[PDB]
Paper text:
Soluble transport of molecules into and out of the nucleus occurs solely through nuclear pore complexes (NPCs), 40–120 MDa ring-like channels that perforate the inner and outer membranes of the nuclear envelope (NE). Here we describe a nanobody library comprising 12 unique nanobodies to the Y complex and Nic96 from S. cerevisiae. Nanobodies are single-domain (VHH) antibody fragments derived from camelid heavy-chain only antibodies.
Three nanobodies (VHH-SAN1/2/3) in the library recognize Nup85. Binding data suggest that VHH-SAN2 and 3 recognize distinct, non-overlapping epitopes, as we observe a heptameric complex of Nup85trunk-crown-Seh1-VHH-SAN2/3 by SEC. After examining the Nup85 crown in the electron density map, we observed additional difference density, but not sufficient to encompass an entire nanobody. This made it difficult to place the nanobody by MR. We used a nanobody model that included the CDR loops, as these residues are most likely what make up the density closest to Nup85. After several rounds of positional refinement, the nanobody fit reasonably well into the density.
Author numbering:
A (entry chain K): 1 to 125
B (entry chain B): 47 to 124, 132 to 230, 240 to 431, 451 to 556
C (entry chain A): 1 to 252, 290 to 347
The structure:
């Protein structure tokens, strides 16, 4: 039984800032798929940002590049998503996603079924 | 390149009514003339040839480089598996000799100077030469285990002198305003640079040791064992290294599965440090501010062999792109990744003498890849050499004319008569000024079978240019 | 190396360095001739002697080889060429330092250019003027610097139109020591090369096509250590033109004329073209008030390495 708690969401004006935080268990070495996803109301869940290597690089989506900033605490199961220049296109429920251990293994049993519970991030017009 | 002929009296101010500007290159380098054929424009402007070195330290540097070149004698181009080291080992000794010569030049420049941009260009050339010697002038194509003591000693040098990011202004920014993350970024940046004493010292400076005793001891012990571990780092043998990295990996595993009686972030700043020391590729790449810090780490703490270099540089170039601010980064990047053709131009933008002799010793090492003398040969080293010679011929420094004439006589390109033509056309312009110097001109006229120029020079000496004085003493 | 006033009240036309580069000769329209010396101790050009002996505007000037002594030739619009030998037994700046050796008055029109032949051909000089007739003179006895006989006369242009103020001429010997005697001529839109034949006479050997306007200056750059010859022309159309010369298929029109480089970086008339002493650097200057330097690349192409001033 491990958990993925996240905080920092809220309701802000266009051009405002928000700071999302998330925590986890295990966070053992590399081979991560750990990152922020988002789901707009009615739409499908899309990836926002993700730490591929351990500080080696970042994978952003093309609608937040140059505005959002992801960071990770070294060798640890925490993430921060700094959302600068928020616009009405970022209104969604954001989810923290990750991986409990880090081995190539086999493609089965992805982490635990409970991901991040979600935090609501809405930016008015 | 755009330079003002005179930062004081500009003869043209407005765009309208363009004036006929005339310019003439003088027989001497630093004394060329310009003027204007127009009304009320009766000023003569002496414009010295742009980007040139007239100092005596430069002449001594060229004298030293030409001594090492003549000292290297007959070496041109020779993978292969036969005979002995021959030029190879000798070439390296020559390489570290010219590196010492360039350093003495840079030192004498920093002492007596008025413009420091020349100092910046020379240091960039020295950085590239350090990278070149580290990459191809120690191991002789082999691996690191063959001669670890020399290789690292050069690598830690090439990184240390290269940039200036580790400096008093930077540290104080983080030393003045343990808890802060920045401290660990700078500690890992020191570690990735092999700056062990600086890192350890900052330790005492760092808040942690007493506090670790105050908090979990174990961690405090551990950190002290890691401080001890860096003092006992072995540079002499790879076998000693093998145990070392084994010890660091055992320490990192033991701490990763241990008690967490500290803060989450402090637990989260110690595991990194242990794994950067262990050589994990992620966080060597994480706490690297540039790519050469990354490359230095991978060579230092993962695998110490030259092979994975191609991989390392690529990964480093995926973390921090080549900084175009300076003119040595892309050269070194190219130097590491096989290609050497591109770096010769850039160094010629820094210093023509250093670039010419660099191409010379590169051809001497081999490292390769219609009959004019000024024409390309195997690796265009003759170009670099013969053009530097032709450049020196106009400098008007009679202490360097022996260097130029010798450098032309030692060219592997051109006939004996081709060099004979070159000397015959160049020697009359020699700045002979003392009565004992003309022995040199006459001896060369005899050496290259040009007695007609010998007697034609003694005619000019005749009557001291037609009784152009009164006493006209020996001096 | 700061600017300094020449001392001329009228327009300065030509400035020429001596063989060693430590002295400088100057001529201006106020009929004046000046000679400056650069002291060895400090970099400060200082006047040696400048009290001309002419009547019309002087245009050209040149130094003779020091194996003949201190000799300066001068050509003016007074249809004459005067020769001067420096008398070292006179104080500097006295009007007494230079003595007239000879005065050539054979030209029936105003002269524009004169240049000394290379040292390996004796005391020899060439002059050209409005008469359109190039004249070669020689000092047959190097002991008598006044026995200046006329060697040759060549009608370069047959019809010199009088009612035109748009005239220009220059001359440039080939500085190569191990090459047949030859000299380039810059007249009007044409540029032709004269070469010494077996009969001791001159002959039209080659031309430089492509010039579509007046040629302000030419300069045979003495390549040192090359089998070809390079000559650069500043043209009024605004194109520095570097031509390559190399005779081919000689059993015994042979001369070759390549057009290595055209450069219009000045966007206006190119007034001055000068070569290095080693033929390594080519200088050019024009209406933009800038001077550009050129070096040869590996593919024998010329590339601008520096541009100076406004």
């Amino acid at each position: 039984q491990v958990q993925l708690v996240e905080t920092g969401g809220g309701l802000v004006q266009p051009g405002g800032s928000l700071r999302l935080s998330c925590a986890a268990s295990g966070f053992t070495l590399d081979d991560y798929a750990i990152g922020w996803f988002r789901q707009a109301p009615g739409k499908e869940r899309e990836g926002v940002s993700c730490i591929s290597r351990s500080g080696g690089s970042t994978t952003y989506t093309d609608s937040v590049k140059g505005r959002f900033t992801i960071s990770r605490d070294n060798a640890e199961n925490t993430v921060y998503l700094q959302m600068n220049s928020l616009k009405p296109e970022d209104t969604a429920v954001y989810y923290c996603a990750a991986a409990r251990t880090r081995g190539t293994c086999w493609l089965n049993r992805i982490g635990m079924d409970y991901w991040g519970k979600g935090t609501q991030v809405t930016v008015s017009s | 390149i755009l330079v003002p002929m005179t930062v004081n009296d500009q003869p043209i101010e407005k765009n309208g009514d363009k004036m006929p500007l005339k310019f003439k290159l003088g027989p001497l380098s630093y004394q060329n003339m310009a003027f204007i054929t127009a009304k009320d424009k009766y000023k003569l402007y002496p414009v010295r040839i742009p980007r040139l070195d007239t100092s005596k330290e430069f002449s001594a540097y060229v004298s030293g480089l030409f001594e090492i070149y003549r000292d290297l004698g007959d070496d041109r181009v020779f993978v292969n598996s036969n005979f002995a080291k021959e030029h190879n080992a000798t070439v390296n000794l020559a390489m570290e000799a010219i590196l010492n010569e360039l350093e003495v030049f840079i030192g004498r420049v920093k002492d007596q100077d008025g413009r420091v941009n020349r100092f910046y260009e020379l240091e960039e050339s020295l950085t590239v030469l350090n990278c070149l010697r580290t990459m191809y002038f120690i191991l002789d194509g082999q691996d690191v285990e063959e001669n670890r003591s020399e290789f690292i000693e050069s690598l830690l040098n090439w990184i240390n002198r290269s940039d200036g990011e580790p400096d008093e202004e930077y540290i104080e920014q983080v030393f003045s305003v343990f808890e802060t993350q920045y401290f660990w970024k700078l500690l890992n940046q020191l570690v990735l640079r092999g700056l062990l004493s600086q890192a350890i010292g900052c330790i005492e400076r760092s808040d942690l040791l007493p506090y670790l005793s105050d908090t979990c001891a174990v961690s405090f012990d551990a950190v002290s064992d890691s401080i001890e571990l860096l003092k006992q780092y072995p540079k002499d043998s790879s076998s000693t290294f093998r145990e070392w990295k084994n010890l660091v990996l055992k320490l990192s595993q033991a701490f990763g599965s241990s008690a967490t009686d500290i803060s989450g972030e402090l637990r989260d700043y110690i595991e990194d440090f242990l794994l950067v020391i262990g050589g994990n590729q992620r966080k060597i790449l994480q706490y690297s501010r540039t790519w050469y810090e990354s490359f230095c780490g991978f060579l230092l703490y993962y695998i110490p062999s030259l092979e994975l270099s191609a991989e390392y540089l690529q990964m480093s170039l995926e973390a921090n792109v080549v900084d175009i601010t300076n003119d040595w980064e892309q050269p070194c990047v190219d130097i590491i990744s096989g290609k050497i053709h591109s770096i010769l131009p850039v160094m010629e933008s820094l210093d023509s003498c250093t670039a010419a002799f660099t191409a010379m010793i590169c051809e001497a090492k081999g490292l390769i890849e219609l009959e004019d003398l000024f024409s390309y040969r195997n690796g265009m080293a003759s170009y670099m050499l013969n053009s530097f010679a032709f450049e020196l011929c106009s400098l008007g420094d009679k202490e360097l004319w022996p260097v130029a004439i010798g450098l032309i006589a030692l060219s592997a390109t051109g006939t004996r008569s081709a060099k004979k033509m070159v000397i015959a056309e160049l020697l009359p312009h020699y700045p002979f000024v003392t009565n004992d110097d003309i022995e040199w001109m006459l001896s060369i006229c005899v050496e290259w079978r040009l007695p007609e120029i010998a007697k034609e020079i003694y005619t000019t000496l005749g009557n001291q240019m037609l009784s152009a004085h009164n006493i006209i003493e020996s001096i | 190396m700061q600017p300094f006033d020449s001392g001329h009240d009228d327009l300065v036309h030509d400035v020429v360095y001596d063989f060693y580069g430590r002295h400088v000769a100057t001529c201006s329209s106020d009929q004046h001739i000046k000679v400056f010396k650069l002291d060895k101790d400090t970099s400060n050009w200082e006047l040696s002697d400048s009290w001309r002996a002419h009547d019309s505007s002087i245009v050209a000037i040149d130094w003779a080889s020091p194996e003949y002594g201190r000799i300066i030739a001068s050509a003016s619009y007074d249809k004459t060429v005067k020769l001067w030998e420096e008398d070292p037994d006179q104080e500097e700046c006295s009007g007494r330092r230079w003595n007239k050796l000879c005065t050539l008055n054979d030209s029936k029109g105003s002269l524009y250019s004169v240049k000394f032949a290379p040292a390996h051909l004796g005391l020899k000089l060439a002059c050209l003027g409005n008469d359109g007739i190039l004249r070669l003179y020689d000092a047959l006895e190097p002991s008598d610097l006044r026995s200046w006989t006329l060697t040759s006369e060549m009608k370069v242009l047959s019809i010199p139109p009088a009612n035109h103020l748009q005239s220009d001429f220059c001359l440039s010997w080939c500085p190569s020591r191990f090459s047949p005697e030859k000299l380039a001529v810059s007249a009007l839109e044409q540029a032709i090369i004269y070469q010494r034949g077996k009969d001791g006479k001159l002959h039209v050997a080659a031309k430089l096509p492509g010039h579509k306007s007046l040629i302000r200056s030419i300069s045979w750059a003495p390549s040192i250590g090359r089998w070809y010859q390079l000559i650069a022309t500043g043209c009024k159309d605004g194109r520095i033109r570097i031509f390559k010369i190399t005779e081919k298929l000689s059993p015994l029109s042979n001369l070759q004329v390549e057009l290595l480089s055209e450069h219009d970086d000045h966007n206006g008339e190119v007034w001055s073209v000068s070569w290095n002493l080693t033929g390594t650097i080519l200088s050019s200057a024009g209406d933009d008030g800038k001077v550009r330097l050129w070096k040869a690349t590996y593919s024998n192409e010329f590339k601008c390495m520096s541009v100076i001033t406004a």
